[PDB]
Design a protein around this ligand. Sequence first.
Ligand SMILES: Nc1ncnc2c1ncn2[C@@H]1O[C@H](COP(=O)(O)OP(=O)(O)O)[C@@H](O)[C@H]1O
Ligand SMILES: Nc1ncnc2c1ncn2[C@@H]1O[C@H](COP(=O)(O)OP(=O)(O)O)[C@@H](O)[C@H]1O
Ligand SMILES: [Mg+2]
Ligand SMILES: [Mg+2]
Lengths: 746, 7, 372, 139
Amino acid sequence: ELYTKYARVWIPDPEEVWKSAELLKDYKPKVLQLRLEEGKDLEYCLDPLPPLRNPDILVGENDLTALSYLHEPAVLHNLKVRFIDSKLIYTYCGIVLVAINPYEQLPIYGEDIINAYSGQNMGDMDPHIFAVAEEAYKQMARDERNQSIIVSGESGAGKTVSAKYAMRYFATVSGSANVEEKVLASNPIMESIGNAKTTRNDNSSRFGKYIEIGFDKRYRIIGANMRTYLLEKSRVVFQAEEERNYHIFYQLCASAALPEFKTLRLGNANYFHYTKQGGSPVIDGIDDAKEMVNTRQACTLLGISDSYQMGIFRILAGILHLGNVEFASRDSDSCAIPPKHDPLTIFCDLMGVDYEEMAHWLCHRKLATATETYIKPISKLHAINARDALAKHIYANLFNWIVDHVNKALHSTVKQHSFIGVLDIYGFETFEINSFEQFCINYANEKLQQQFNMHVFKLEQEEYMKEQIPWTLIDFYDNQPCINLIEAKMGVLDLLDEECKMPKGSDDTWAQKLYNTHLNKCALFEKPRLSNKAFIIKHFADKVEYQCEGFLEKNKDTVYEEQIKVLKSSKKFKLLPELFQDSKEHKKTVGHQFRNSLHLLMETLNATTPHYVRCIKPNDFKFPFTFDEKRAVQQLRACGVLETIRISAAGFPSRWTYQEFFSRYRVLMKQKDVLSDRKQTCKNVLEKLILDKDKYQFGKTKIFFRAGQVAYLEKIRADKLRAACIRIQKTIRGWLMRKKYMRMRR
Amino acid sequence: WXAXCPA
Amino acid sequence: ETTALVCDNGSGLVKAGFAGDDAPRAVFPSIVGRPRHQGVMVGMGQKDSYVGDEAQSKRGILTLKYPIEHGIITNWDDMEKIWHHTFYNELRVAPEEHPTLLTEAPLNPKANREKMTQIMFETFNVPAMYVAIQAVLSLYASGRTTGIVLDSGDGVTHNVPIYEGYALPHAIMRLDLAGRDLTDYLMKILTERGYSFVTTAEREIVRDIKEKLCYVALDFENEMATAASSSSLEKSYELPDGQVITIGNERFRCPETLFQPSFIGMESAGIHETTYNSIMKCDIDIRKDLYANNVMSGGTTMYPGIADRMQKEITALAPSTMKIKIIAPPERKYSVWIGGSILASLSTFQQMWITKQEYDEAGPSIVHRKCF
Amino acid sequence: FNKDQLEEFKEAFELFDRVGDGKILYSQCGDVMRALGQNPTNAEVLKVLGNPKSDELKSRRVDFETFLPMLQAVAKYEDYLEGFRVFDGNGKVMGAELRHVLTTLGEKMTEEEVETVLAGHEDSNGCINYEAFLKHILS
Ligand SMILES: Nc1ncnc2c1ncn2[C@@H]1O[C@H](COP(=O)(O)OP(=O)(O)O)[C@@H](O)[C@H]1O
Ligand SMILES: Nc1ncnc2c1ncn2[C@@H]1O[C@H](COP(=O)(O)OP(=O)(O)O)[C@@H](O)[C@H]1O
Ligand SMILES: [Mg+2]
Ligand SMILES: [Mg+2]
């Protein structure tokens, strides 16, 4: 309880998530009279207290946990003032670095500052991405244990540029005769093959890129190794309204006029069924015909020969032409490719395979028992599903092959002693429409934030072991019940993969199975009130509504072996046989391949120690260096920052070294009482100032405080300092009054 | 079987 | 995870494999042989009994017993040898570690399920078991939830109407003509040409003749008059010793008994009129969906022209404006196994197994309680 | 107040009558109180004046007899030392910091008052011995 005249509080507002308010009359234990901006009128209805605001000396601090009052208004205000007023883009919460896209360039990344951060401890400096990279480089010396920097956020938040600078730090401080040129020259390739225009923004990355920077026994840089995970294979063949698939297809179509590409017989970007679907072939302000050239130049610098480059573009033209193969039904249970079909003719020319062999194997599938073998016709729907699964399988193998040749250039012969690894992964996503891609993205973000919550819980158990404090005080948010909902048997993915193979399964009967299995059995699964074709998952960040329409089309891969063996028979050019050189994997659905890829990622990260960077995007319009409250709060919830802060507010947020406590509150402690050691001095003085110890704890090195007690001490400190100013001013002012009065008497 | 047929 | 075993006890063949496989890993005749001759050579290495392909290879030396006839297991000691050979020699898998999906024909004796379960839990100590109607699996195998499945094995034929995933148990017809009664009739008609096949090993030459050379007439009387009037249908085959035998109008005459069981002196109507009489027991709202989706199943439906003869002769019975369709996939011999492989891999199925805990609590009667 | 005090105070008061009516302004009351050895705050002065409004504070005039109860009410060491020791522990106070706090906190004074009282009391480092300065300012 503190509320008085001239107190300040935050109030909610549909326009800006909180308004500042002046408290105009003291509270009495029932409705509050408040002054505001724009004059003053409010009476504010309590419900069966308003959030209360940090004294102005606190706001703008380097560390959001150093605030006395912790809540979403205080955090949003600190980040807003630091970004708008001080032009500082980096901030800390707990261990987590928080980074905001200035979204115009800055001086801040200069080599002078890079050198200024080297050797510094994380609290010695104002926050910067180099402080995280430096802590990683320190921890890798302090223990041989490898270190991971996990960069996360919405698309466009600056995850790639943050990785760029994080690597530039290691390469400047450690690096010597080079990695930097090759790694940065790899980016246009991985962006070309792996990025797409999403609904909300252009150039979203649809895969998790992981760069291992390798160090020798003396922590000079050896070299780097690039891994990839969670590739969104389904985008190859299916696209929503005003999406595109991967940029490379459009750079290729835009290059159709070039003389190298005449043989590929390419058309315009909406001639092909795998690029027509989105209805938006041109990005505003991107010339795909020039990103083509920057792609081929990035390939050339990494030493993918022009022969292999023409192989890559031949295979992509293959996939584009494959997508235009049209099947006519001849029966409910049989279909055929029509005679002399031009797309198949051009595909078989490009790939160098017999037209009539592909024409047969596209329309038929084959089974053999141990003795004898059978050939079945298949329906037009199964032929279209098989062709799409073949296109997805080609694309995924091409992507893994380009990543392997990039790795050939990035690897170095010296035996890697240890690595620091940097991860550029999409953040928790929520869209006006949410689809299987979003369900995968949010399940991966559930796993990553489980890892995060365990790491934070370990770190603060270990600090309490540094301070002989009971563990029971601390607790953490457990999101295992949602992982079990998504991942376990009879889970949402398991009932999807079942419905892929049950006869005449559909999104409509899948949804019914979901409702039957979870609807009132699980607290985290909910049905939307007015629909039978959607469901709601209660993620850690928010409730998200997923639409069942077109899960099963996206869910399904099965590649008929005889079509791979036809492609593997190709003799025209080197690359196409080389892709498929080393089953159940051909049966596995996209959801299971994603589950497995995510388990590989979590096996990679759990073997390591993480350091986190969260990126948030200030505004959707690309306006330089301006900030929107309403997006930023959504981001800070999607990043789990607000939960971490609430949980800390439940515990002991504020932690003062005794000597800093004295340096602040000497005014509080009398010249008599101070002792020959200040630790015991403050141990007494605080017991004077706050009657009940339960508000605080005494560690070996710090005083721990519950939320609010610092604001109380700063209040009473400032009021006593003003009483001292009253004494001194009253004495000097009264002297001048005496002086002029007695001069008049003189 | 057991009646109407040999098995 | 551990896969389930999927195992189908046909009368003629065992099909076995692992759930999620596309075709069965072991197929062999469900036959047990014993030596019937004096053991002259000392030290040869005698064997009390051969099973499967071993008993095929030796079959000149052996009396061959089938331990299933008409889908009933008629002596258990042989059938337990067949399962022992299936798990340990053909699949090479420990039955301790995998659920086993068995299979049965409908409307057969209740005791067959009690014993068939008891032997799995006591002898093989399987973790969990199930038993599934043959004709139900052919719908999983053929991508359908609605149809009338005609399924014909070595030992039994049955019709099972299924509409939208509900079986109609009053409309199930069972008919007891099958590949073995075709084979025994085929021996009797082959006697008309002087060829006589007598022994159990020699019967199984005739079975291979039936498989290679039989076909179903599209008009029995017209092809009878033709082959009585022309050599054009007459065709010839080599016995194992190199004797040639020549077979004429008779090669269609034996599978015609499926459509005229009076040739065997059987009471009933043929598979076509039992199919139509099965559809006439279903509710009139669903007959239009049971006149499509006639699914053929099992080996005795593999004869050339049987789908055409079925479509023709149902079309003579059904009203003139119902679309009669016969659906006969080329792998229909294995379709019961393929459907067992699908059924055993569904996650919704993993609650359905009879676990050893439940058999311990209830005893074998539980198989009737926890199952169709 | 005794007769001697009343005579000295009345004489001093009459020297301050700038209109000839035997009166001073309300706004001078505090100055007279401070000149007579009192050290009231501006708040205390306004309280004993009855929190007057601007017009009567600047132009309404009162004689000694009405002033006297207020002077009495205003009239009726360790704190002064600790107050200076806030800004100390070698017995000094920065001149810049004292100037800033006195001109920006509390009942803010002018820079000239602080310069006048501080003249000659700070050393080359810019430090004031506050015990000596305090004795000086309390006399
Ligand atoms: N720290 C930064 N300083 C200046 N500009 C930045 C910074 N971070 C991001 N940007 C700008 O924002 C753009 C989008 O972010 P980027 O990292 O390229 O996309 P994504 O985060 O989806 O990989 C960058 O291309 C750059 O123009
Ligand atoms: N291609 C074929 N043509 C005609 N009859 C066949 C053919 N294949 C198998 N049969 C006969 O069908 C029976 C075997 O069918 P099958 O489906 O294996 O029975 P089950 O499933 O009960 O073991 C045997 O009588 C065999 O002679
Ligand atoms: Mg990027
Ligand atoms: Mg069968």
